[PDB]
Design a protein around this nucleic acid. Structure first.
Ligand code: NA
Ligand code: NA
Length: 327
DNA sequence: CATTAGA
DNA sequence: TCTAATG
């Protein structure tokens, strides 16, 4: 957690670079299992050889660990950190819609900068267009203050469209959080579940409602169950307009709402931990259901959930407010 | 780990 | 269809 800090830090810098800059899946997959285990290690790594005794650590990484142990730096790391090209890839990538794949391509074409991007908006598809368009706003965190405003809006229209709809703002926002990266709305309706063959309109209707009143201002992607777009708070009695914020709404079969809601609320850790608990308690939990575990090894049979409570009860735990779903 | 776009 | 990109 800190005893192995720079080493795992370096290890991860390395990993990242294989993946994005080069296309070295393996190498990259390498650096990471390494960084995974040396991080688990209970003692201060004093040398290569020592590290070396670990699973995943090879001659390769070892060598690296020595140089870094020996001197506060690594050359390769020093070179990459300099390198224009690899620098560029790191940057473009920050643009929603721009992955490494495209990052690479643009670069080799000569688009390195943000400006570069503009002069060639034409080489970009929609997503990247918006991504570029709202680059600055997309990077800004979302105040809880704002979040409450946003939330207030969505729940409102959603209702007006159908009073039978159930929506939930999941994420850190849900768990207290003073800020947030983007709004996630979990949605379901009673006429939509595991069997009942869809009703795409169900998503569509609300997306529409939202655009109608000007909340959603762009669409990154609209499918029949997942909409990914852009929103914005009505810039009041002017002098101050709001940022463009990413937003995603997802339709869920009423019959899996809670797991889904559980899950999305996180935290990444509470999950696992909650996840690990249900196992002993003779169960299984994933994004959608909860299945009693059978002896033969595994087993199935989706248990009936009407609230986040049902889940807890099931596994006989303490209903934990979201606020405290921190770990 | 799954869904949407794209070409 | 495969492949990319967010989540
Ligand atoms: Na080893
Ligand atoms: Na990006």
């Amino acid at each position: 957690e800190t005893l192995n800090g720079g080493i795992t830090d370096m290890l991860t810098e390395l990993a990242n670079f294989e993946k994005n800059v080069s296309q070295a899946i393996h190498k990259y997959n390498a650096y990471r299992k390494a960084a995974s285990v040396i991080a688990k290690y209970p003692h201060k790594i004093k040398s290569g050889a020592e590290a070396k005794k670990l699973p995943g650590v090879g001659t390769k990484i070892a060598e690296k660990i020595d140089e870094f142990l020996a001197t506060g730096k690594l050359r390769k790391l020093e070179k990459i950190r300099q390198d224009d090209t690899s620098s560029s890839i790191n940057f473009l990538t920050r643009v929603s819609g721009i992955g490494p794949s495209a990052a690479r391509k643009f670069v080799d074409e000569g688009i390195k900068t943000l400006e570069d991007l503009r002069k060639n908006e034409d080489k970009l598809n929609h997503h990247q267009r918006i991504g570029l368009k709202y680059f600055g706003d997309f990077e800004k965190r979302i105040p809880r203050e704002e979040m409450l405003q946003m939330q207030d809006i969505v729940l409102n229209e959603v209702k007006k469209v159908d009073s039978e709809y159930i929506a939930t703002v999941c994420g850190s926002f849900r768990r207290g959080a003073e800020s947030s990266g983007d709004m996630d709305v979990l949605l379901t309706h009673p006429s939509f579940t595991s069997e009942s063959t869809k009703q795409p309109k169900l998503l569509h209707q609300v997306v529409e409602q939202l655009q109608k009143v000007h909340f959603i201002t762009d669409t990154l992607s609209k499918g029949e169950t997942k909409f990914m777009g852009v929103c914005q708070l009505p810039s009041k009695n002017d002098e101050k307009e709001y940022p463009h914020r990413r937003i995603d709404i997802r339709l869920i079969p009423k019959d899996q709402y809670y797991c889904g809601v559980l899950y999305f609320t996180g935290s990444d850790i509470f999950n696992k931990n909650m996840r690990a608990h249900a196992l002993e308690k003779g169960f299984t939990i994933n994004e959608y259901t909860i299945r009693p575990l059978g002896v033969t090894g595994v087993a199935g049979e989706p248990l009936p959930v009407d609230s986040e409570k049902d889940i807890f009860d099931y596994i006989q735990w303490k209903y934990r407010e979201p606020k405290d779903r921190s770990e």
